[PDB]
Curated annotation (Swiss-Prot):
Location, primary (coarse class): host cell
Annotated RdRp catalytic domain residues: 1001-1189
A biological process from GO: DNA-templated transcription
Boundaries of the shown chain within the full protein: 1 to 1745 of 2263
Gene name of this polypeptide: L
Similarity comment: family membership: Belongs to the Bunyavirales RNA polymerase family.
Organism encoding this protein: Bunyavirus La Crosse
Subcellular location: Host Golgi apparatus; Host endoplasmic reticulum; Host endoplasmic reticulum-Golgi intermediate compartment; Virion
The protein's name: RNA-directed RNA polymerase L
Domain comment, as recorded: The N-terminus contains the endonuclease activity (endoN). The central region contains the RdRp activity. The C-terminus contains the cap-binding region.
GO molecular function: hydrolase activity; metal ion binding; nucleotide binding; RNA binding; RNA-directed RNA polymerase activity
Annotated region (Endonuclease), positions in chain: 1-185
Free-text comment on the cofactor: For endonuclease activity. Binds 2 Mn(2+) ions in the active site. The divalent metal ions are crucial for catalytic activity. For polymerase activity. Initiation activity is stronger in the presence of Mn(2+) than in the presence of Mg(2+).
EC number annotated for this UniProt entry: 2.7.7.48, 3.1.-.-
Amino acid sequence: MDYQEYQQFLARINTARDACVAKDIDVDLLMARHDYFGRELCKSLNIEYRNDVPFIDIILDIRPEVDPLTIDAPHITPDNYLYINNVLYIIDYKVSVSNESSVITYDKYYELTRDISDRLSIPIEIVIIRIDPVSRDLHINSDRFKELYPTIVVDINFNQFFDLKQLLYEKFGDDEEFLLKVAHGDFTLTAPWCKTGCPEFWKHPIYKEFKMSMPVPERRLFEESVKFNAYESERWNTNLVKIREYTKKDYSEHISKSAKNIFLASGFYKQPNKNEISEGWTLMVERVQDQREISKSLHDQKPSIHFIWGAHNPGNSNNATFKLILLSKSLQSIKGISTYTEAFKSLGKMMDIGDKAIEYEEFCMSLKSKARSSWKQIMNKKLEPKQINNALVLWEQQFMINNDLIDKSEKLKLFKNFCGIGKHDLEVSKPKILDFDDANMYLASLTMMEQSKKILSKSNGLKPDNFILNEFGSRIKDANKETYDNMHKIFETGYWQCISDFSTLMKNILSVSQYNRHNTFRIAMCANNNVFAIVFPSADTVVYSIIVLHKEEENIFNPGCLHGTFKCMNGYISISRAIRLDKERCQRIVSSPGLFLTTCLLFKHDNPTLVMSDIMNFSIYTSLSITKSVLSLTEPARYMIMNSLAISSNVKDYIAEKFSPYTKTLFSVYMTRLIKNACFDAYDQRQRVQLRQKGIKDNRELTSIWFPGSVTLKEYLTQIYLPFYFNAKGLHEKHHVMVDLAKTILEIECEQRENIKEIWSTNCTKQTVNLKILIHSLCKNLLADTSRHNHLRNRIENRNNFRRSITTISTFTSSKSCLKIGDFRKEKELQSVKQKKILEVQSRKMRLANNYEMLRNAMPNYTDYISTKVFDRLYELLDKKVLTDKPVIEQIMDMMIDHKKFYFTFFNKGQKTSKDREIFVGEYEAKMCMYAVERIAKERCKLNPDEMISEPGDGKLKVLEQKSEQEIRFLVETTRQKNREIDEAIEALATEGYESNLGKIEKLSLGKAKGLKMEINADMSKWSAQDVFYKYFWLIALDPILYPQEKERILYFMCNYMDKELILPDELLFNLLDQKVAYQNDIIATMTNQLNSNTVLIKRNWLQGNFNYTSSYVHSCAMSVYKEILKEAITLLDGSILVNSLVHSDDNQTSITIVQDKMENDKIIDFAMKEFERACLTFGCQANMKKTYVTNCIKEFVSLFNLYGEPFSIYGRFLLTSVGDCAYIGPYEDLASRISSAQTAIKHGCPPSLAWVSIAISHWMTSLTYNMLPGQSNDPIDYFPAENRKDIPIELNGVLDAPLSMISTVGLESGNLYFLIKLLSKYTPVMQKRESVVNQIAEVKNWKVEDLTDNEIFRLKILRYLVLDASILTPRKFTTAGSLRKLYSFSKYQDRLSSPGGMVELFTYLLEKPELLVTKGEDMKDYMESVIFRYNSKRFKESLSIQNPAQLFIEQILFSHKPVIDFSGIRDKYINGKVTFTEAYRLLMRDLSSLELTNDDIQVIYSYIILNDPMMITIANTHILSIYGSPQRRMGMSCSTMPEFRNSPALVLRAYSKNNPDIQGAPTEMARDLVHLKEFVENTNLEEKMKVRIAMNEAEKGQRDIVFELKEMTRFYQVCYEYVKSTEHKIKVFILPAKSYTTTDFCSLMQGNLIKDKEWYTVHYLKQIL
RNA sequence: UUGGUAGUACACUACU
RNA sequence: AGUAGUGUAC
RNA sequence: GCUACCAA
């Protein structure tokens, strides 16, 4: 270029300060380069350099004899032109590395010139002459133009333009307004996250391993790809395109070579058939018998259920004290001489009060009356046992184990041999199970089931009326009469009474066991006057034996836990074995009636074939399995049966390798059979499932699995997949799990260490990647995915808060576990000594019924650590100034370099699976690094159409549906196109003589096109443990949105992460060190150097959970190559194919649809499955062919189905959780937790009737928790003005009355909404009745408040004075702040207590910044102070101690008669010690006698609940204005998304508190928010209302009340926080009977769908629904 | 904080 | 006894 | 572990 021009540009660059000025430089730098090229080009072409000539000048140059006024010359201005030989060459110069500019220019110029061409007969050639400024190659489109100038030599250099453009861009590299302007249309960046890179990367051994293993050109291409800078390059994609083109040859060879395997394919793909199943079963038994200790003996059986049962005796009392006597005389009078009969007679004698009945009752009543006076426990007053006849009584139903009444070796017999207390080569023996495969052992199971059938299927003598039927039977019946009739059929049987009795007795056993002692036994009862339980001494878990009285002998339910039936005074007495269960398993039994009723009705649903008696017999044993045996069968059932009916599967290898029956239980022997039978039965009806849409019309052609009968496909899948959900959580033992996990991780590591060397390959070696195919696919995908969003790096920054402070991020301030490494020898040794002393104390005290320091010495290379809470580890790092309040990403970038050594540990999930899963726990700073990598991926997965782990909400279910609609349409129309010539030839030929000439009709109709659908439902194996981590190095390196600095640090981290060490936890080390015998081939010893170290180096296993987004993206890539191969292979058969593939971490749902005429379909299947496996292996995944299975109608994907187009789900899994899913806080709060399960089940397609049943079971379990059932102690019915429990409010443990449409949408808050809708529809005049909701509420002033019934007035008082500011009855517990020693931030809070006035300073800080009472705030100081303040809360401190739901459950029962309600906190919301539940009912009613409601109070209720909520106005409008069409049957359901009904809080509340909207942090729009906010303040008077509230308090108290000011400011600013916060719209997908488009559609569909099982109703509205 | 002493509190109670 | 287990536990 | 009391 020109010299003096360069000096001017170089000056403009130095003097520029704005980005607007810098942009103008860039514009002219580019135009200068364009001009420079043309001036040089024209010299080579030997033509006049014309600057920019209008088109009219061109015509006037070459054809003077033509009029400007007549011809309409196209309005363009070409850079040059050339007229020779009656041809006009219009010329345009370009300087781009791409010809996208050139093709726009060509098309514009070509299109316009056609019209003017015909009016002059001059042909026009549009010539674009491009030069690629980097290479310097020319590119010319016109074939005539190159025939004129065949040798163009523009010798030219652009280096001075790159030098200049560089200087400009280095100068404005951080100016984000520059990056915006400079940005092309298609791509935009933001400033670097760091200035320097990381040179220590390039020296790192793992990179050198990585590098050295690649071939040389790829090495250069990696280093080059790291160093790329999309902002400083000509175009963003050059490095990606450069690398795509280099790999293209090797890639398209691999695709073509792989596609031609279609012709090699035999067609003998792995199928299921009778032989495979028997061979699988026989190989399986061979394994199981080598692995277990088999037993053909029925006395080796363990309890199938931990209970024995007998019917009640209605000739006897059901009084507590009669029952106690009845048992005491029965035990003392046991006739005969058995091995334990002396012990039981003694126990009976030890509980013997004789005639002294009233003396017992009044003694017990007095002790109880003492405990219930106090909120806390009664301390320092000793419990003394009263002598009442032979019984020494410590408490109601607690009796001293008296030494006089039992020979002291019969006492030892009871404890040691019967209860196991203190009970006791080279090898350790195998686990013992029953021989499930032995036919005599099977018949014993078959017997037990037929024996249990006989007793339990008989009618109990009782009225079938219980809580569920009484309160909800009305609405269950209305939705479906059949399910009401079924409930009756269940409640009549002994089944239902047995399990109710086992539930109620267990509830009581737990209540009783709490305060049982080492020197006492206790007695539990139930409503059945013949069933009891003796709770033995714990010896520290719950020990017990069940006792049944009965008239005749063998007439008791014995599911394998009877010790013996004995003859006694009156009839017979049967006593169970001694059972020992942890409290978690016991809770499950309490909840079992809900499970049973739910299970029975669900299996029986809408099916006239099945017999209810047989269902109950199966369901009772499933509902009461609290033991591992059944876990071994329920989930494998899925794979065995589904593999058995698949088109392609591997039933042999699944059963052979994986299926491991664990039959300790006769019921599990019976069930293992039902599974086997079902595998064969599945094969036998394989053609009844697969095609030869019609899945919508569901007929009963399949054989039932678990009980005899006939079943539809939907009902058949529900039978296969539901059983898994009978599995309880927490059945595992930490002791055993920790070892199994530790050793499988180390086995995978040791295997890799010894055998797995090569990283790359070309023949699918185990644990390798095809390097060039990886590189090429990644390039194509990154190009594609980046292209479809231009601000991607910006999207990543905003959505994941990269720019904001670390303290504003929800995951970086959580209560999750978090590892930290350091020296903690003193803290851990002084824990050891404290638990030594306190164990020795309670050991020495227990003699009533008569180490860490070492570990460290044994481990020279130990690595100390301690787990803590994430927010606490953040506090710590901020305090020691390792972290700052700088933008999170900048600090993540520093951490990647700063944190060299990585450390992880694990704990056990306690999962419902047969083998328990591991959960990994890393350091805080490891979570910081992975955040960046994962959140980058996450946003790019959202752009990828295949990738679904990133799909928000329930979108998956709607995506499955849209694919199968698309695929069905493709199959049909594509088969119609390929046939129509043949179909017209045959159908026109078969008009004249359809019968005759049938040799010619089938001449052509064999050669017509064959349809083929196949659905691969795939699982992958060892997803995290056996990946090739090295492949992700390319994913980072190729990434155009990363700068080379960031890439360098990210890759350095990823190198360090492959050196990460796993810490075997101290719990596991103790267990292992305590082993007397050495373990044989001890993998844990091998990998620790004889337990010298507590760490093992883990390399290839990126730890499960950590890289799910990036791994899933690469899995999405493997499927793009699979699509490409299949597309080629089918074009070799001139066929048609559609391939879809959905990917979610290690789950896959690929869907092939093919039409071709050249080949047998079986060979195409054998091809597609082989190439599926290979596609996976070429990218480092391993498809698990024991679990993957192919159908042509059924897509399973992340436990969501699609059956012939129609979506389907096991809604039953959500219904089973409705029973035992709760935190145990209060009646409202617990019920709400349980109701949401029914809402989730509803949106997965639960029928209205079964949803009502579920809702009843929730109400039952909730009221049971706080002793609030009908007739019970805390039952509110008699304390309130109401004739039903649906008339009392839901907040005071009422019963929920609303339409199920309403409950689906708004939950418990529907209880009040509907009540207010009932009032409007009674107390507004008939003229106004036809109006919408806004007008009916406006008519509230003209209401006869006199006419309002008592009840309605009562409810409105609660809505006014209680509901509108916080779910009000809440038991408050007295418990301690257990185990906060670990928390760094807790000891700082403790120091702030010890400081003089230290807290008072902090409280006053938080009143001056009331923003922090309901946010965390952007500042560092603001985070740390708000943390220390939270420790002031009791509820927050109990959150950090590990929760225990069975204790939380049982404590909540026991304190239901104590005074646990703080009525001052309830009352002080209307003022101008503690109290019991029932007293709180009296005190609340009398407060309502001191209040009245005017017509303004009612208006205020309707305003807050209805009018100030768009959704509530809508839901109200729909119910009032709706009119229903006639009923109709559901014909195929459709997924529809629930629409949004609605229309910076941390800053806005700071801006509200101090009236400036001008804070160091983020304009006019945050001054607008304050004006919009102050509307809400002046309406409700809150600022000027709480001032009266505080001043009144401190005037009465006499001095300034600092804590009350905090509490009132909190509830003031918490009301402000719940206005200045948008409902971030979650995606909720609902299965409905038609498709929703509008918002009104969803409401009408919902309203019409959820009222009967039989049918659905269309719903319309008479006015608008907004 | 350690060392000592003496305690460590409650549901179901039902047409059966 | 019960719970757990081809890891010595409760 | 909690509670009351005592002793450094």
